[PDB]
Structure formats: C-alpha cells, structure tokens
Amino acid sequence: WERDGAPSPMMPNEARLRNLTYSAPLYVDITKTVIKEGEEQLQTQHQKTFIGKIPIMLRSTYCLLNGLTDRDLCELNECPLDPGGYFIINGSEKVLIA
Amino acid sequence: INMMEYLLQGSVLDHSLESLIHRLRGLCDNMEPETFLDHEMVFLLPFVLRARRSMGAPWHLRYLGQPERHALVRNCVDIATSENLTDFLMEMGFRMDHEFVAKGHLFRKGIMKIMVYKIFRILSTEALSLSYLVELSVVAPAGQDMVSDDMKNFAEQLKPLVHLEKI
Amino acid sequence: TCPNHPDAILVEDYRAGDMICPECGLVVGDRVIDVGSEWRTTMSSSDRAMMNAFKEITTMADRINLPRNIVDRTNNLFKQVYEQKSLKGRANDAIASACLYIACRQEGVPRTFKEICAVSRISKKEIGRCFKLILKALETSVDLITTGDFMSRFCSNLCLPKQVQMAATHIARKAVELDLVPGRSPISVAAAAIYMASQASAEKRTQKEIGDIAGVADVTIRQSYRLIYPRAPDLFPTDFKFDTPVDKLPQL
Amino acid sequence: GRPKLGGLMDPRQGVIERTGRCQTCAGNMTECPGHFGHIELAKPVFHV
Amino acid sequence: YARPEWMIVTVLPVPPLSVRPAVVMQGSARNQDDLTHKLADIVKINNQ
C-alpha cells in the first residue's frame, strides 16, 4: 500500500530494494449470530474480514513468481536460477532453518 | 611573524617631571634625548587604526588588537607606510573621528622604551591634560612571560615618582 | 582554547579524537572528542494514557494500511495536544482519530472523515469536533483538500485502469476550475468524476459501488454527476479512448 | 539550561562539557579526575 | 579504619560526573546516566 492508500502488487525485487516485507493479506469469513432472548436470532456474515498479513515464501504457490516462465522472471528482474524458499522481511532475505 | 606588546601607563605632574626627566635619563642608557612631535589619528571602519606623522620620517601606522601577569598585552602589527596614506585610507572607506598631536621626550632601554608626553587636542593646539603620561611599550615577537617580568623590576625602580599600572 | 591563540577555532580530528589548533597544530585535549559517537560512519497515569493512545493509533493506522511515518506524525500530534490539555474533556480515542486525520492531511494523503470513522469507534461528528479543537490548540492549519487527493485511492480500490484514473482526475480538476460544482464537497466531485470516467471506459462501476468506496451517497454522486454531465466532452481529456462515446454516457 | 550548584550535575563535582573546566581544580575533562558530592539523609539508611 | 556505626548510611556519597558521564543522543538530548536517574530519585525522596 502506497502512502496514498492505493494497493499494488509487490514484486520481490521491489520489496528487497524498498525494505518491505513480502506479505500477503489474510481474510476470514466471520459469522456473528446474536440471540436476543426474544425468540429470534440474527445471523450476519462478514465476508473477507482482514485479520493480518502472512509473510510469503518466494517461489511458493502463493508468491507472485509462481508458474512464471524464465522469461517472465527476467522481465521482473528475478534470476530464474534463484530457488526461492525464503522470506523477505524488511528487505532482508530470511531462511527458516529446519 | 607577529608580535604583541607589553605596555602599562601612568601620569606625572608638571613640577614632578623636572625630577622625572633627570631620573629616567640617568637610570637608563642614552645620550641627549630627542623631543618627538607627532600628529596621530584614529581610524574606524571595529579595526581601530592609528596613523602617526612626525615632524621627515614616513607615516607610521599601528594596529592594536583586543587585550589578551602584571602587564597589558594586545596583538599588534605595526607597518611603516609612505606619504599620502591619509587620502589612501579615505578611498578605503575608513572615517576619521578625531586626531591629536603628542609632545614630549622618550628614553630607551635594552628593549623597552619610555616616552613622556602630553596629549594635545586639535580643532590650534590645546593641552587636554596638565600632566604628562608615561608607558613602557615593549615589542617582542612570540611574547613570553620572561619579557614581561623584566618590566616589573624597572617599574619598581620608577615607583617612587610615578606609580603606574595597566588599565 | 589554544593558550597562545586568543579566540582560536580548534579543528576536530577523527584519528585521535582531539581538537587541535590549525595554525600551530597544538593538541588541546588528548582524546576529548569521542569520535565513536561524534562520527556516525508503576507507570504514571498520563504516560499510561499516552501509551494506550499510541496503541490505538497504531491499530487504526494498520486497519487502513497507513505508513509508519504517518503513525509517528500522529503520535507527535497526540503528544502535543495531550500535554496542551485543551481537549482533556474529550475522549482519548476521539483525540487520536482526529490526530490521525490531521497527520494524513499534513502528509498530503488525506483520508475522509468517514474513512477515519470506519477504522475508529468514534463517530464522524466527534472526530470533526476534536479535529477543530486540535487545530485551534496547535495554532496550525491544514491545506484545503482537492479532488485529486482521493483519486488514486478511490480508483485503486475500484480497480480502475490508470487511464481511467487519469481521466477521472482530469475531469474533477477541470470541473473545479470551471466552477461547475460550487460548494460541492471534493469527495463528491471526485466520486462523480470517477463515475463519469468509468461509464466512458470499458470498466464500468455502478453508483452504489463508487459510493461504497468513496463514502458518498449515490444520490450525492448523482447530483454532482448531473452538474458535470452537460460539459462532459469539455471535461474529458483530449487523448481519451472512449469505449462509450461521451454523447451516449448515462443521463441521470 | 546551565549548571546549578547543589544539583546532580553540580559543576563542582567535575567537568560538564568537553570544552569546559570545573571550578574546583580548574582542570579540563582529561585532567580533572572528578570530585565527589554528598547527600544528607534525614533518616539513617541501612547499607545493602 | 572501620567503625560499625559507619556501616549505616547517614550521608550518601554522590559519584563525580566522570563516574557517570552524561551522554548525548539524537542531537543534543543529554541522556543522563542510570546513576543520575537514581540520584534524582534519592534526592526527591530525601527532600520529601
């Protein structure tokens, strides 16, 4: 999200350069049912309530560089040989050691 | 090379002087002192400058900085200049506020100099003060405490007639 | 403070951390400069309330993904207002929301009062009142909002193309210049311009959609759009690819 | 905004700023070893 | 050299500035040492 509030896809190279966190918004469907004791219950469903952001491992199924051909990666300034498998937190490539 | 002076002043009554001149002449080494008549000015742009003419020597000007021990010392750079300086400093932009001629006699020493004189105000010479003034101006590059100490001994010799201190 | 040099500026040194007279080289101070720092190479009630306000500000900012710089400006504004204490009678939550709005305005990415209310439990009326009081207390001012301020966010949330966003921005700016919408709120004018551009482009958005994102009633959008509709060809950019011709734009 | 006598940053106790000298021993930051102060306790206090 | 009564704290020594020198951070914001903060605490409590 830019300072003006306009969302835009975040490329991993952009995250690395701008010290951003490669994270994906997370939404939950939440059903709230209120029983007033008046013999009627009101059920309202909030669709896709934002609950936070999850850092995304690069080259995973949920990364922007998923299923992209080597030419597309080159156009995005990403090494096709780069295996991914790490997270970009504040622009720092973090790898989770097993 | 720049030198800062050691000077400190005092005044002497008229009747007193007749004893002082003989006192100073005998005490220090010299022959037949000279009466020095000079016409001094002061120039302000703050950078107070003093240009002195003496009645065929060239116009000698001197600057004294702000004072920096038993002595009064301020950085001084004295430079001899040829004639037609006054108009030169007019084209500089300096302005002359007052000018006074000084009359009297000066006696020397190994390094230090004694000059006894009275300040004359100009309009036409008038005696600003009835008593002369005496100082012990000493010029020495890279001033050190040793030079100032020697003045203390000499001043103590002259203490009885006139007691002088820096101001 | 070179002893032989009255009023001498001593140059700092990084090799030894000392200040040295430049004209003689005398070392005044041995290791006095501390090059390591010089060269960069039980809680009180008031403080607890301030901390709670900061936490609320961070929550509200993250709700709409506001940057940490705006958050910090909001924190500073809240500190100033809270210590000034002219708003001590007002809720800390309302003060925080108004400070967040003022911080957005000062940073040049204003959010509508409705947008701030959507993330704050405080109502729009209370937020506006606290905003006025905060402006008076700070003796400062905020630049008047313009239609172009909200175009980026509104178009991005509506997922409109960049060309459509440019067309909407140009339409709103030209309408304001021509004075076709006197007194109308900038948000309403921007919503009407966005509706015009969307209807003239392939990506068509309903009045309800635009009102939902912009915080403006479809009726208000209708009024503004009706005011700008007669001169739509004049308002539209010259090099705009009209999927729907300007003549055939919806009339309402 | 200036050192005050009887305060924690007492100028007597030593040098405050690097380009300064304390009033007690007239020594700069490097030369001055620092001088102790004292606090009178209205009630005697145990030593841990 | 050591009297038992001296073990009780009646006058509290105050370390010189050199022991607990004031630090500068974020410009000219003088960051007083932990010793300075504690000495402020004892000073306030003693005055009270």
Added chain:
Amino acid sequence: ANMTFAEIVTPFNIDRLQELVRRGNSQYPGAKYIIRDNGDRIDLRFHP
C-alpha cells in the same frame, strides 16, 4: 606509517629527527607528533 615510536631528541639524533619532522606524516618515513618539554602535543600534518 600508522604506528609510531617516540624518540627523545638528542644531539646525536637531532638532525635525523629534524629531517623526519620535515618529512612529516605525509610521506613515510616521517613523524606524526612533536612533544615539547612542556608535555604538549603538536600535530605535524595540521601544522606544516
């Protein structure tokens, strides 16, 4: 060049140390500081 050894000036080495001082810190071998009998330190590069 960074490291230095303080040699005491003697008539035996007066000329050699004078030459080293003249060379100064700029060109190795040279000197970095001169300490007078007063104990004061003079920076050669600052004062050429």
Added chain:
Amino acid sequence: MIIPVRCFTCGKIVGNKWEAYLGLLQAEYTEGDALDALGLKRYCCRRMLLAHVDLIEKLLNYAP
C-alpha cells in the same frame, strides 16, 4: 561473465575466438576439434574456451 581477452597463463589472444568456437559447435565440431581449428594448441589456452561460462548473454536479458 565474458570471454577473457588473453589466456591467463601465456597471454595468447583468446577473446576473439568465442563466437567462432560457438559457430563450430553449431557446425557439429567436437570441442577438441573446434579448439584445434581455432588454433589453441596449448592446454592453457584450450582451458579458456573449454571452461568459459558466458553469463553476459543472460545478463543482457534484463532491461537496462
């Protein structure tokens, strides 16, 4: 990244033979036969072409 101008060992000009070497490989020459045709007799020179990796070709795929 790019073929060295000179053989590191003996200094023979080797920077003008990369394109010809690739052309021979396309023309179905074995690597040794292509090196012999190019005239690289010393194994020090043959190593230059045999072990070279032309990363510049892929580096050019990124827009300037």
Added chain:
Amino acid sequence: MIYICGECHTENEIKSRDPIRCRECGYRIMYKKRTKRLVVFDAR
C-alpha cells in the same frame, strides 16, 4: 538533479522538497544518473 525511473527508465528533474516519484510512470524507485565528473581508469 536528474533521476531515472527504475521501471520505465525516464529521466526527470526532482528538487529537495518534492516527493521522489516518476512524473508519468508513478514508480517510486529512482536512480541517480551518472555524474558528469569524469573519472580516469588505468587499464590495468
């Protein structure tokens, strides 16, 4: 003060007060253009 957009490679003048952003691209990563001052390299 000329800056090159990191996406579209467009030069644009930018002052010390205005925000750093491409004039037409909208891209927020900028690269300073190479200095006019000429640097000498020994071909060693």
Added chain:
Amino acid sequence: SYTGYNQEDSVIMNRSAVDRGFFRSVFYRSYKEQESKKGFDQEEVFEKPTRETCQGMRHAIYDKLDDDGLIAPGVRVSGDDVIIGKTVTLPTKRDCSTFLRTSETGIVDQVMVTLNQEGYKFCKIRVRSVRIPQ
C-alpha cells in the same frame, strides 16, 4: 617448492596472470540511510550541509555530494569521504552525515532513493571496489 614462498599452506601466484584478470573480483558494499521525521522538532533531511550553517561539521570535504545530499554514481570515494549528507535539526542543525570505511576505496556504483516500509525517504548507495589478487 620453487622459492619457499608457498611453504606451510601458502601459494605462489602468477603476477602476469593476475594482470590478465586472473581471479580478479568486484566487492559491492551497500549503505542504507533513512531520513526520519520522528520527534517534536527532530527531523532528518538529505542535503549537503555547510561549515557554518550546522552546529558542527568535520574537516572532510563535502564537495562530492550533490544538491540533494547524495553522492552521484561514478565518483571515486576513499576514506574520510561523505557519501550521504544528512542534517538533524537541533532541539541550528547538527550534522548527521555518514562516512565510509577508511580502508575502503571504491567508486559509487548505484544510488537509489525510495520510501521504505515506514514511508520515510531513504537512499541505498552501492560502492564498487575492485579487488585484484595480492
């Protein structure tokens, strides 16, 4: 065992080969500097300071920096050189500029300016230094 200079896990290298680029390398070092307007009146701004405007500065020359306080690419930088000129307003403005490693002596490779995750302006400067085997 040619001359004994390769003894005890040591190596003798061909100077001519090294001259011909043998095992020659680049060392890229990236410096990141952010300007933060955090504080009541404590703001940081990228700009080339002046020896008199700021509360205090250094003998290091600031001529390398540009009007924006950033060193342009292609400029040789050695020790005691300012690559980023920052000023933090005093609660004058104190000099908050950043220097390089004294040993390091390279050329400014790439200077980029952007907004970090916090929205504050910051610059990343990549300095390139050529390491010939020695």
Added chain:
Amino acid sequence: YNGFTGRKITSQIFIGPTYYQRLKHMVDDKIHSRARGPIQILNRQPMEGRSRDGGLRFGEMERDCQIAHGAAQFLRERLFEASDPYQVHVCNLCGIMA
C-alpha cells in the same frame, strides 16, 4: 625450467589444470592498526573510531605469557601505559585522594 636461470629443474614437476576458488577473506578487509587512537567515555580505553583502530585485546593469556617472560616493564606498559595511562594526587596521611 627455472625462470631465473632457465636451467632444467632436476625433478620433474607435477603440473596441470585444477579448479581453484578465491575465498572472501582478503587481507585488505583484515589489516588494521592502532596507534594513539580514540578512547571511550568511562573506561578511557581504546575503541575503534572512524576506522579499524580499536586496538588489540591484551588478554589474561598474554599477561601470563609476559609474566613468564619476566618483562615486567613491558607488561606494565601494555596494560597501563598503552591502554589508559592516568595519574592522581593522593594524600599521604589518608589514602583516599582529594
């Protein structure tokens, strides 16, 4: 053949192509010296400033080595004169200084 003289080397050398690697450890990044450099605030002891001139730690093992050597003057120099020399005025009657 010997390069200096051109004479055949009596033993026949084993020479051939081998794959070598240049490690990141360069002497340029490791060389550092300290000679009358900056010191910290409280300890008045050496600390690296604007360079790699933080000095070297004269540890307990080095202290014991110099003790075994018997170089008392050098040990005193290293621990006192080189690190943080200092002098204080102390009263003879009462040991506490003033």
